[PDB]
């Protein structure tokens, strides 16, 4: 199993037990999830996205203008990480990131916003939307903002 973690915050984001597809010419990953129902805890049944509940992702809120401010700083920070670790990626990342930001802002009303369990404001903001079938959730992550953890057995909850 591969655990995908936030390059900035080191929080767990998802694992390769889900269907993962690359979009935006390798800039983003779309991770397909399922709605699940669990008891929480007079107790109540809660329903949510398995990606969110399994990895303890935390919902947050943005105005469109606040997200614009956040995402320009985030893409600058990933640029710096690439200059340190993967210099060959910097130029195509800048190009793709600017266009993907345009896409996200144009489709802004169609996303919910999630961050890692420790809620670092400099970490990645994952985007939740639903497929046309109106039942399947999926989440968008920035591929260059992830690090991979190998885990053959007995995955540990850590950051």
Element (H, E) at 38: strand 35-39
Is the Cβ–Cβ distance between 131 and 119 less than 8 Å?
A: no
Q: Which residues contact 12 (CB under 8 A, 6 or more apart)?
A: 3, 4, 5, 6, 55, 56, 116, 117, 157, 159
Three-state secondary structure along 6-27?
A: ECCCCCEEEECCCEEEEECCCC
Residues forming beta bridges with residue 36, ordered by sequence position = 48
* Structural domain total, the chain: 1
Kindly tell me the burial class for residue 98, based on how many C-beta atoms sit within 10 Å of its own C-beta (0-12, 13-18, 19 or more).
exposed
Structure tokens at 153: 């057995």
- In whole angstroms, what is the distance from residue 109 CA to residue 125 CA? 15
Is the Cβ–Cβ distance between 6 and 126 less than 8 Å?
A: no
Is the Cβ–Cβ distance between 158 and 68 less than 8 Å?
A: no
Read off the CATH number of the domain in which 21 is found: 2.170.150.10
- In whole angstroms, what is the distance from residue 128 CA to residue 137 CA? 7
Q: Listing from the earlier edge strand, what are the strands of the sheet with 12-15?
A: 12-15, 2-6, 146-150
For tokens 């203008």, name the residue. 65
Determined by X-ray
Residues comprising the chain, all counted = 159
Instruction: Give the domain range for residue 145.
Output: 1-159
Q: Listing from the earlier edge strand, what are the strands of the sheet with 137-142?
A: 19-23, 28-32, 137-142, 126-130, 112-115, 58-60
For tokens 């970490």, name the residue. 123
């Amino acid at each position: 199993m591969i655990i995908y973690r936030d390059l900035i915050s080191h929080d767990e984001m998802f694992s390769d037990i889900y269907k993962i597809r690359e979009i935006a010419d390798g800039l983003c990953l779309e991770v397909e999830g399922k709605m699940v129902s669990r008891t929480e805890g007079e107790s109540t049944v809660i329903t949510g996205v398995d990606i969110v509940m399994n990895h303890h992702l935390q919902e947050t809120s943005f105005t469109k203008e606040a997200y614009k401010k956040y995402i320009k700083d985030y893409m600058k920070s990933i640029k710096g990480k690439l200059e340190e670790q993967r210099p060959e990626r910097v130029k195509p990342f800048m190009t793709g990131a600017a266009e993907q930001i345009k896409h996200i802002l144009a489709n802004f009303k169609n996303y919910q916003f999630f961050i890692g369990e420790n809620m670092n404001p400099d970490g990645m903001v994952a985007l939740l939307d639903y497929r046309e079938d109106g039942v399947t959730p999926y989440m968008i992550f920035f591929k260059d903002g992830l690090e991979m953890e190998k885990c053959l057995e007995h995955h540990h909850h850590h950051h």
